[PDB]
Amino acid sequence: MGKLSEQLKHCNGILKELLSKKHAAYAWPFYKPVDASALGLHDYHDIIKHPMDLSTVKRKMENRDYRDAQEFAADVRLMFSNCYKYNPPDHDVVAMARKLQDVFEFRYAKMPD
Ligand SMILES: CNC(=O)c1cc(C(=O)NC2CC2)cn(Cc2cccc3[nH]ccc23)c1=O
């Protein structure tokens, strides 16, 4: 019933949408941790100090790690910030990040107060 639980269920809804087939064409680079070794990105962990991905966010939601919506948002935005910091701004992964962030920001804005 409480405000924090209700706001966290909004976040869970967003999370579920970000991982849905509706957004899969652009969301898929954010499903799993960046495997820097597999992708040849041997400078990734020198540039990105706090890696984040939707699977980690989902793990933290399932483990009741997130105490409020603001904590959930900070992880989702960190994932996007990491993409914008590491990747050239003309790489498809950045375009895909932009589109998924647009989904995140517009539904997050509708959070029950
Ligand atoms: C969060 N993900 C990343 O930061 C990421 C970085 C790089 C990457 O190679 N970045 C280099 C600096 C350019 C490659 N991938 C895979 C990928 C994703 C999307 C389109 C693609 N087209 C070709 C590969 C590819 C990612 O998911």
Swiss-Prot record:
| Outcome when changing L41A | Reduced binding to histone H4 acetylated at 'Lys-12' (H4K12ac)
In the UniProt annotation, what is the result of changing N87A? Abolished binding to histone H4 acetylated at 'Lys-12' (H4K12ac)
Which Cys residues form disulphide pairs?
none
| Cellular localisation | Nucleus; Chromosome
| Consequence of substituting L39A | Reduced binding to histone H4 acetylated at 'Lys-12' (H4K12ac)
Positions of the Bromo domain: 2-111
Q: What else is known?
A: Some specific inhibitors of BRD2 that prevent binding to acetylated histone are promising therapeutic molecules for the treatment of cancers or inflammatory diseases. ABBV-744, a small molecule, has been tested on tumors with success: ABBV-744 antiproliferative activity is mainly restricted to cell lines of acute myeloid leukaemia and prostate cancer and is able to displace BRD4 from chromatin. GSK046 (iBET-BD2), which specifically inhibits the second bromo domain, is a promising therapeutic small molecule for the treatment of inflammatory and autoimmune diseases.
Quaternary organization? Homodimer. Interacts with E2F1. Interacts with (acetylated) STAT3; promoting STAT3 recruitment to chromatin. Interacts with CTCF; promoting BRD2 recruitment to chromatin.
What is the stated purpose of this protein? Chromatin reader protein that specifically recognizes and binds histone H4 acetylated at 'Lys-5' and 'Lys-12' (H4K5ac and H4K12ac, respectively), thereby controlling gene expression and remodeling chromatin structures. Recruits transcription factors and coactivators to target gene sites, and activates RNA polymerase II machinery for transcriptional elongation.
Write out the domain note: The first bromo domain specifically recognizes histone H4 acetylated at 'Lys-12' (H4K12ac). It also specifically binds histone H4 acetyl-methylated at 'Lys-5' and 'Lys-12' (H4K5acme and H4K12acme, respectively). The second bromo domain recognizes and binds histone H4 acetylated at 'Lys-5' and 'Lys-12' (H4K5ac and H4K12ac, respectively).
Similarity comment text for this entry: Belongs to the BET family.
Its name, as the record gives it, is: Bromodomain-containing protein 2
Q: Source species, please?
A: Homo sapiens (Human)
Gene behind the chain: BRD2
Give the shown range, full length included. 344 to 455 of 801
